[PDB]
């Protein structure tokens, strides 16, 4: 079947024909995009996959990059669903392609997805990132690649030749240059590349916009629940180094009282079993905390010429179309992972003292005064001990601090600089959600919908959820083709207005039709984005 | 008429028979309570009036103490009504008495009123402090004295024998000891003395509670729109001195490059025409500001053993009944006096920059960071330039900072220490009010009502206002006799609950019946009373 047989710039491939509810889909899973970054390649910028003979099989999902695996709640769908579903391996630089069966007629727009997992975990192989529905139904050419997370992706000794950092991003950039020079053959338009990701994938998409060289490889961008500018998606060189060598040292690299040879250091590191590194991953953070990750993009003054803050602050984004948004309760999920009093198993009605402590875990960089400021802001002084309030407060400190305000800081900075921005607030809690009611709509629970999982009848969502999904898919693909999530020409009732400095408009993405709103946590985010920082830089 | 003829501990007096709408009233205006504090007596603690021969005439209002007179809006009722209505003079230590005609049967409870005017102005002679209605109607024995304001009342060189400070308070204490030993003769009960005042009079009442010796002279207390503990009702010794000598120096005291003789300094000051002092009164403040006064009670470690803060913080008020309250917009009035953009003549829709400046005038002690904090708190980040919002914000910064939060800090501190406290929010704007609508219910516009001015038909309020007034008078006199503003035994519908740490209950004093509420600006006041201070003590 020529539908499943495609010649790529480096060789032939054989896809597989998948069956989505509305029909058939072509799927080319496992395409090498680079030479496995193993052995003496570990910590190195990726290299273009060499051309192969014969017909490369591409009927299946490849190995997940090497990464920590979540224990915490073993056998629990809520956590497991995020875990690797393929074998772990340093040989994981592959991407996927879904195209409607049969290949489109003309150059369809492409949706390149970037998975997220703190920069330390994640995989395109995942169920919720099943690009079949968006290709099947909205007739889109969808691509999802794997990029090195953890030490392998980001361990860096800034200035070094052999562990220079951000290589997990270069992985994604490489997948992008491949989509450029080969998506054509799948019926995709190399001229309408729309990047889109969640958590650190969103953060990533952000970095592509902030990085010159990534510019020519995409035209539109979506950033769900995450940005390049907050407190957790980048570290300085100094800290990077501090965590590289510290990690090395715990692994015996270098052995003895040796030193001053970054090369020997990396050479040594390059011999340790992958799992040895993952084993010490979490011991290099400088404080007890949540929503903070050990190995993530570093401000090298290369891939990022300066901090994302400085960049979105003075960049020229005068033409960029960008969709951005957030969910009802970003912070909830993270509380179970480390804030005394919280669990998925009870209502986590915490004490005040617990909440006071939470604030220091959740805002680890905060001095005392700054912590005080945060407590002032989130305490309800008519009921400073209501456990239920405290509980939700904790979730807000975390969610606002890491996701919401940073989103809003980016939305506004973008708009003010030229961007056409759109914003939203996912508020629908999936019926199927396995987390406790108290977490409401946790970080990452919009994905099922954007990808169109409710369209699968076996999966069993509600018809509303299904319709909902379709609506969501429609907005995305529409922003994808046009650069406006809006019903074509067809001005079908509710409209989605561009987020603007002055009006500050965003929409409620939920079961009830679009419902425009103004100001994304405006006060709260003024707290965080405007004042808090000066407090911190004083203390 | 023996009704109008009374023998006092120091001589005979002849009252005059006044006619209130509901009947006749005995009125003994002008009773010397002390030896005129003139000449070598200036700046000195008051002395008990010597006994006189014959029949002291007391049919009229005496001279207002020496004080600045408000220009600003000449001929304008709103300001004029506060101005002296008698001749100015250092010889002004007299008090007044109103008793129902004819003298009560049995020992009626007494309401001693303390006028307020920044500690720099004011007089019992004023129209709104007409005690005839409260005596006539509620059959109360009412007393209102004059106390030295300004330099004469408070100029102090702490530690000095001749200008030791707080003498304006000693004036009031002296009036109190007189009520003690003579109110009896007017049918008043020396056993049910209820002090009650507004602005600095409230602040004063506060100081009596905080001062041991004032204790035995009163049993209940009311504090309207003012407390002893805020930012403006007390100064330290050091500042007192700094403003005494600076004032002296501007007046040529001492002349030349002389010095180190406080006595010579005061001696010299004692020769300057009263108006020479008033002339430089306003030049000793340390910063540009509003709701800040030059000469006011000083923390000498005598009349006040320590700051009012420390005192209400550790005092034993376990038995004290205290009514406390505030008006809708305390801060409004003060804005016209010095905050660029405000006037009584336009809507004062200020700019943002104006508001930013306002904040520094209105919170003169604030460092930059602290100012930032205040701006953060009062800015509406969805509309940071809406003039109308800015406008009202300014009024709130001032009103909350100086009156409301301090009231709330006192209410709570009192309650927590044993006091039985009651609280309220006057929200009715008199129909007659001559200030612009934008000031809503300005500092001091409850007085007309408590005193019962609407009962006078000529004055022409509304019947509701009249009824309202009666209600208000009822609460006061009731708190006065019982120590509970509540309808006797007669549980007549809405009840007024004690303000409590835990429930934080207060009531809406307005046209519609009592309406209990919880938390007096709880967040906002947490800002001011809890956090702001630590910010300031850091900066």
Contact A15, A130 (CB under 8 A): no
Contact A429, A419 (CB under 8 A): no
What is the set of domains in chain A, with CATH numbers? 5-302 (3.40.50.1820), 316-446+499-539 (no CATH)
Which residues of chain A make contact with B519, given a CB cutoff of 8 A? 381-382
Q: Which residues contact A494 (CB under 8 A, 6 or more apart)?
A: A513, A514, A515, A516
Q: What is the CA radius of gyration of chain A?
A: 23
Q: Which residues contact A243 (CB under 8 A, 6 or more apart)?
A: A235, A284, A285, A294, A295
If DSSP codes are grouped into helix, strand and coil, which group holds residue A484?
coil
Documented resolution in Å: 4.2
Nearest to B498 by CA among B510, B489, B486, B482: B486
Output b/e per residue, B130-161; b: 16+ Cβ within 10 A.
Answer: bbbbbbbbbebbbbbbbbbbbbbbbbbbbebe
CB pairs under 8 A between A and B: 43
Neighbours of A89 (CB within 10 A): 15
Classify residue B308 by its DSSP letter.
Answer: H
Distance of alpha carbon B7 from alpha carbon B22, whole angstroms = 27
Distances (CA, A) of A446 to A222, A309, A325, A509: 13, 26, 10, 10
Distance of alpha carbon B26 from alpha carbon B14, whole angstroms = 10
If DSSP codes are grouped into helix, strand and coil, which group holds residue B417?
helix
Q: Which residues contact A501 (CB under 8 A, 6 or more apart)?
A: A412, A415, A416
Shortest Cα distance, chain B CAs vs residue A522, angstroms: 5
Q: How many residues does chain A have?
A: 539
> Are the Cβ atoms of B519 and A381 closer than 8 angstroms?
yes
Closest CB to B523: pick one of A381, A518, A519: A381
Closest CB to A376: pick one of B369, B379, B527: B527
Mutate to test the interface with B, among A531, A533, A537 (most CBs of B within 10 A): A531
Distance of alpha carbon B251 from alpha carbon B269, whole angstroms = 8
- Dihedral-angle region of residue A96 (phi above 0 means left; psi in -120 to 50 means alpha; beta otherwise): beta
Which residues of chain A make contact with B373, given a CB cutoff of 8 A? 531
Both tokens of residue A325?
């948004």
> Are the Cβ atoms of B519 and A382 closer than 8 angstroms?
yes
Elucidation method = X-ray
Q: Which residues contact A440 (CB under 8 A, 6 or more apart)?
A: A328, A329, A332, A429
If DSSP codes are grouped into helix, strand and coil, which group holds residue A157?
coil
Alpha-helical (H) ranges within B251-321 are 262-269, 274-280, 308-314
Classify residue B439 by its DSSP letter.
Answer: G
Give catalytic status of residue A330 as yes or no: yes
CA B181 and chain centroid, separation: 24
> Are the Cβ atoms of B530 and A379 closer than 8 angstroms?
no
Distance of alpha carbon A205 from alpha carbon A198, whole angstroms = 9
> Are the Cβ atoms of A369 and B527 closer than 8 angstroms?
no
Closest CB to A519: pick one of B382, B519, B527: B382
Sign of the CA dihedral with B475 first, then B476, B477, and B483 last: positive
Number of H helices, E strands in chain B: 18, 18
Which H or E run includes B175? helix B167-182
HSE-CB at B533 with a 13 A cutoff on CA atoms is: 12
Both tokens of residue B103?
């003298």
Rounded to 5°, angle at Cα B366 from B362 and B367? 140
> Are the Cβ atoms of A522 and B381 closer than 8 angstroms?
yes
CA quadruple A185, A189, A190, A196: dihedral, nearest 10: -110
Q: Which residues contact B491 (CB under 8 A, 6 or more apart)?
A: none
Give catalytic status of residue B281 as yes or no: no
> Are the Cβ atoms of A522 and B369 closer than 8 angstroms?
no
Angle in degrees, 0-180, between the axes of helices A352-362 and A368-378, rounded to the nearest 10? 120
Q: Which residues contact B100 (CB under 8 A, 6 or more apart)?
A: B23, B24, B25, B26, B108, B135, B136, B139, B140, B187
Distance of alpha carbon A187 from alpha carbon A198, whole angstroms = 26
Closest CB to B538: pick one of A369, A530, A534: A369
CA B41 and chain centroid, separation: 25
For residue B243, count CB atoms less than 10 angstroms from its CB and return exposed for 0-12, middle for 13-18, buried for 19 or more. Answer: buried
Shortest Cα distance, chain B CAs vs residue A386, angstroms: 12
Give the chain B residue nearest A525 (alpha carbons).
B381
Q: What residues does A99 pair with on adjacent strands?
A: A26
Give the chain A residue nearest B527 (alpha carbons).
A376
Classify residue B50 by its DSSP letter.
Answer: P
Among A138, A198, A309, A330, the one annotated catalytic? A330
Contact A402, A364 (CB under 8 A): no
């Amino acid at each position: 079947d020529p539908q499943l047989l495609v010649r790529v710039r480096g060789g032939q491939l054989r896809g597989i024909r998948l069956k989505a509810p509305g029909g058939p889909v072509s799927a080319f899973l496992g395409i090498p995009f680079a030479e496995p970054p193993v052995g003496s390649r570990r910590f190195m910028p990726p290299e273009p996959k060499r051309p192969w003979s014969g017909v490369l099989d591409a009927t299946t999902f490849q190995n997940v990059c090497y990464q920590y695996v979540d224990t915490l709640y073993p056998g629990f769908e809520g956590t497991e669903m995020w875990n690797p579903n393929r074998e772990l391996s340093e040989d994981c630089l592959y991407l996927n392609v879904w195209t409607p069966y049969p290949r489109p007629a003309s150059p369809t727009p492409v949706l390149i997805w970037i998975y997220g997992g703190g920069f330390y975990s994640g995989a395109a192989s995942l169920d919720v990132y099943d690009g079949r529905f968006l290709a099947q139904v909205e007739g889109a050419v969808l691509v999802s690649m794997n990029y090195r997370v953890g030490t392998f992706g980001f361990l860096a000794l800034p200035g070094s030749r052999e562990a220079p950092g951000n290589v997990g991003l270069l992985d994604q950039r490489l997948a992008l240059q491949w989509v450029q020079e080969n998506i054509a053959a799948f019926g995709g338009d190399p001229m309408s590349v729309t990047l889109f990701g969640e958590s650190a994938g969103a953060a990533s998409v952000g970095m592509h916009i902030l990085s010159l060289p990534s510019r020519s490889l995409f035209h539109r961008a979506v950033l769900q629940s995450g940005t390049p500018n907050g407190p957790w998606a980048t570290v300085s060189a100094g800290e990077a180094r501090r965590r590289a060598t510290l990690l090395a040292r715990l692994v015996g690299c270098p052995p003895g009282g040796a030193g001053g040879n970054d090369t020997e250091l990396i050479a040594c590191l390059r011999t340790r079993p992958a799992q040895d590194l993952v084993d010490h991953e979490w011991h290099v953070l400088p404080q007890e905390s949540i929503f903070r990750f050990s190995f993530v993009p570093v401000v090298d003054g290369d891939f990022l010429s300066d901090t994302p803050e400085a960049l979105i602050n003075t960049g020229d984004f005068q033409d960029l179309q960008v969709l951005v948004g957030v969910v009802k309760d970003e912070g909830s999920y993270f509380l179970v992972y480390g804030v005394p009093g919280f669990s998925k198993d009870n209502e986590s009605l915490i004490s005040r003292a617990q909440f006071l402590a939470g604030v220091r875990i959740g805002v680890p960089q905060a001095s005392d005064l700054a912590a005080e400021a945060v407590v002032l802001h989130y305490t309800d002084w008519l009921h400073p001990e209501d456990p239920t309030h405290l509980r939700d407060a904790m979730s807000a400190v975390v969610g606002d601090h890491n996701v919401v305000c940073p989103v809003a800081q980016l939305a506004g900075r973008l708009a003010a600089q030229g961007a056409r921005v759109y914003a939203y607030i996912f508020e629908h809690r999936a019926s199927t959600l396995t987390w406790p009611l108290w977490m409401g709509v946790p970080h990452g629970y919009e994905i099922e919908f954007i990808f169109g999982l409710p369209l699968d009848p076996s999966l069993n969502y509600t018809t509303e959820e299904r319709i909902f999904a379709q609506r969501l898919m429609k907005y995305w693909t529409n922003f994808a083709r046009t650069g406006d999530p809006n019903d074509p020409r067809d001005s079908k009732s509710p409209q989605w207005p561009p987020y603007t400095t002055a009006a500050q408009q965003y929409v409620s993405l939920n079961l009830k039709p679009l419902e425009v709103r103004r100001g994304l946590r405006a006060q709260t985010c003024a707290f965080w984005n405007r004042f808090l920082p000066k407090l911190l830089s004083a203390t």
